[PDB]
Amino acid sequence: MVKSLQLAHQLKDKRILLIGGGEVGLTRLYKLMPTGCKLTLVSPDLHKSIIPKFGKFIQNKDQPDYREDAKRFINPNWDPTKNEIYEYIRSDFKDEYLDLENENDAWYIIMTCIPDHPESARIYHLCKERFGKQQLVNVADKPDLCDFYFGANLEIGDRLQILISTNGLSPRFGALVRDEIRNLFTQMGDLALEDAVVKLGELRRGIRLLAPDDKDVKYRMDWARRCTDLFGIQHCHNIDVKRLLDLFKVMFQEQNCSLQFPPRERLLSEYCS
Amino acid sequence: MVKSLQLAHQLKDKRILLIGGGEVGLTRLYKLMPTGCKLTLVSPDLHKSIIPKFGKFIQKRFINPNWDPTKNEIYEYIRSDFKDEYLDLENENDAWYIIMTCIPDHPESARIYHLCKERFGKQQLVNVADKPDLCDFYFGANLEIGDRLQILISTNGLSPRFGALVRDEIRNLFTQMGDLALEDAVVKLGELRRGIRLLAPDDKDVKYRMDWARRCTDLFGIQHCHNIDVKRLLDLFKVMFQEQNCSLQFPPRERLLSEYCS
Chain breaks in chain B (C to N over 2.5 A) after: 59
Distance CA B176, CA B134 (A): 40
For residues A146 and A18, membership in a common domain is answered with yes
Q: Is B262 annotated as contributing to ligand binding?
A: no
Provide the CA B82 distance to its chain's centre, in angstroms: 29
Secondary structure (H, E, C), chain B: CCCCEEEEECCCCCEEEEEEECHHHHHHHHHHHHHCCEEEEEEEEECCCHHHHHCHHHCCEEECCCCCCCCCCCCEEECCCCCHHHHCCCCCCCCEEEEEECCCCHHHHHHHHHHHHHHHCCCCEEEECCCHHHECEECCEEEEECCCEEEEEEECCCCHHHHHHHHHHHHHHHHHHCCCCHHHHHHHHHHHHHHHHHHCCCHHHHHHHHHHHHHHHHHHHHHHHHHECHHHHHHHHHHHHCCCCCCCCCCCHHHHHHHCEC
Please report how the helices B160-177 and A193-209 are oriented relative to each other, as an axis angle in degrees rounded to 10: 120
Identified catalytic residue from B68, B94, B105, B130:
B130
Q: Which residue from B11, B96, B136 is facing A9, i.e. has the nearest CB?
A: B136
Decide if A136 contacts A108 (C-beta within 8 A).
yes
Distance CA B145, CA B128 (A): 29
For residues B114 and B205, membership in a common domain is answered with no
Does B6 contact A153 at a Cβ distance shorter than 8 Å? yes
Q: Which residues touch A52 (CB under 8 Å, ≥6 apart)?
A: none
For residues A141 and A257, membership in a common domain is answered with no
The CATH number for A17's domain is 3.40.50.720
> What is the dihedral sign for C-alpha A4, A5, A6, A10?
negative
What is the DSSP annotation of A11-24?
Answer: -TT-EEEEE--SHH
Secondary structure (H, E, C), A159-199: CEEEEEEECCCCHHHHHHHHHHHHHHHHHHCCCCHHHHHHH
Please report how the helices A219-235 and A241-252 are oriented relative to each other, as an axis angle in degrees rounded to 10: 150
Residue B16, beta-bridge partner list: B39, B98
By C-alpha distance, the chain A residue nearest B15 is A134
In the three-class reduction of DSSP (H, G, I as helix; E, B as strand; rest coil), residue A42 is classed as strand
- For residues B12, A110, B152 and B1, what is the CA-based torsion angle, rounded to 10 degrees? 160
For residues B80 and B156, membership in a common domain is answered with no
Cβ contacts of A228 on chain B, cutoff 8 Å: 161, 165
Name the residue range of residue B34's domain: 2-139
For residues A16 and A89, membership in a common domain is answered with yes
The CATH number for A237's domain is 1.10.3280.10
The CATH number for B158's domain is 3.30.160.110
Q: How far is CA A6 from CA A192, A264, B150, in A?
A: 27, 32, 8
For residues A109 and A177, membership in a common domain is answered with no
For residues A182 and A250, membership in a common domain is answered with no
Query: Which of B6, B92, B119 best tests the A interface by mutation, with the highest count of A CBs <10 A?
Result: B6
This entry's atomic model was obtained through X-ray
What amino acid occupies position A63? Answer: Q
Surface-to-core class of residue A81, CB atoms within 10 Å of its CB (0-12 exposed, 13-18 middle, 19+ buried): exposed
For residues B28 and B121, membership in a common domain is answered with yes
Does A147 contact B123 at a Cβ distance shorter than 8 Å? no
Structure resolution in Å? 2.2
For residues A20 and A146, membership in a common domain is answered with yes
- Strands A38-42 and A15-19, sheet pairing: parallel
Distance CA A11, CA B2 (A): 8
For residues A128 and A28, membership in a common domain is answered with yes
Strand spans (E) along chain A: 5-9, 15-19, 38-42, 72-74, 87-89, 107-112, 136-139, 148-149, 152-155, 160-166
CA atoms within 13 A on the CB side of B245: 0
Decide if B192 contacts B230 (C-beta within 8 A).
yes
Q: Residue B71: how many CB atoms within 10 A of its CB?
A: 14
In the three-class reduction of DSSP (H, G, I as helix; E, B as strand; rest coil), residue A77 is classed as coil
In the three-class reduction of DSSP (H, G, I as helix; E, B as strand; rest coil), residue A153 is classed as strand
Phi, psi dihedrals of residue B178, rounded to the nearest 5°:
85, 180
In the three-class reduction of DSSP (H, G, I as helix; E, B as strand; rest coil), residue A261 is classed as coil
Q: Is B90 annotated as contributing to ligand binding?
A: no
Q: Count structural domains, chain A.
A: 3
What amino acid occupies position A67? Answer: R
